[PDB]
Design a protein around this ligand. Sequence first.
Ligand SMILES: O=C(NOCCO)c1cc(CN2OCCCC2=O)c(F)c(F)c1Nc1ccc(I)cc1F
Ligand SMILES: Nc1ncnc2c1ncn2[C@@H]1O[C@H](COP(=O)(O)OP(=O)(O)NP(=O)(O)O)[C@@H](O)[C@H]1O
Ligand SMILES: [Mg+2]
Length: 280
Amino acid sequence: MELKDDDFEKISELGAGNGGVVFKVSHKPSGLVMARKLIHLEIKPAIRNQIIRELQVLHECNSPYIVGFYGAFYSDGEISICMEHMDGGSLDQVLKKAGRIPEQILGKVSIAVIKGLTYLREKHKIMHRDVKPSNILVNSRGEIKLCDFGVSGQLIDSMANSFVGTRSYMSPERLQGTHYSVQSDIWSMGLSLVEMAVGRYPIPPPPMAIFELLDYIVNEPPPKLPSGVFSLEFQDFVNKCLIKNPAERADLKQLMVHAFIKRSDAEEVDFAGWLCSTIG
Ligand SMILES: O=C(NOCCO)c1cc(CN2OCCCC2=O)c(F)c(F)c1Nc1ccc(I)cc1F
Ligand SMILES: Nc1ncnc2c1ncn2[C@@H]1O[C@H](COP(=O)(O)OP(=O)(O)NP(=O)(O)O)[C@@H](O)[C@H]1O
Ligand SMILES: [Mg+2]
């Protein structure tokens, strides 16, 4: 869209994670209100421009289930990724205001997440590589969209994601040296669903620093939903997502026809209204 740091004006901070900070900004010359993610990396100009070059592909993403992209550029040691502003935030934020999320809302989220993944896989042959509650954004129109996926191979390598932060959604196969695949996103999604359903990160079942957590994941059995509160469909769905053997774990075709999804797809759920009310 042709953006440059002076076009912008800061409205407020939407939040920060381990690797960056996101601002709600005004893009003055167009009038657009967007979210601006700033990423700071101590890398040589060569690979940096390679990142901005690779990030340019986000322009060709165009799906109801994928967050909107406006442009990526570099300035002042910061890489800027400029997005559709999502007025409802991430599901990780909603989760703090709501404590936990209803399995009917979660069925809608799953249908969104599944469709978004398939879109990225069918249309761009990229895997998401970071499906978690904080990377699922919602807005007051009741839309549910994925962001922060691995569009840039250079950017992935530079961020050394795997050891940072306190929670991990990495799958067993990956932490045992397997090549990355869509199955690994299924595991992430199920672990996400469990976390959003019960209201806390499932591993371990009710201090653990990253490496122990990672060891715990490849060794202990997978997390499961509690015993009385959720339908037996929702927990078979989540169970089929968290099968430790990627061979057995369900795939997107299978999940899309699972009992839980068929029902959720039919249930008349007012997500926007549930949202503006849970957080207003
Ligand atoms: O922003 C990111 N992650 O957030 C961390 C920094 O706050 C981000 C990270 C990576 C690299 N990566 O790929 C996933 C596996 C782990 C990993 O390290 C990447 F390739 C990206 F393109 C990113 N941004 C991004 C993508 C789509 C939209 I629409 C908007 C965006 F901002
Ligand atoms: N397009 C957007 N619209 C509104 N809020 C956003 C948008 N993108 C990101 N955010 C918020 O900005 C904050 C940080 O996002 P982010 O930088 O990716 O850290 P994170 O994904 O939460 N954890 P991590 O990826 O490990 O650093 C979160 O609270 C998001 O909900
Ligand atoms: Mg994120």
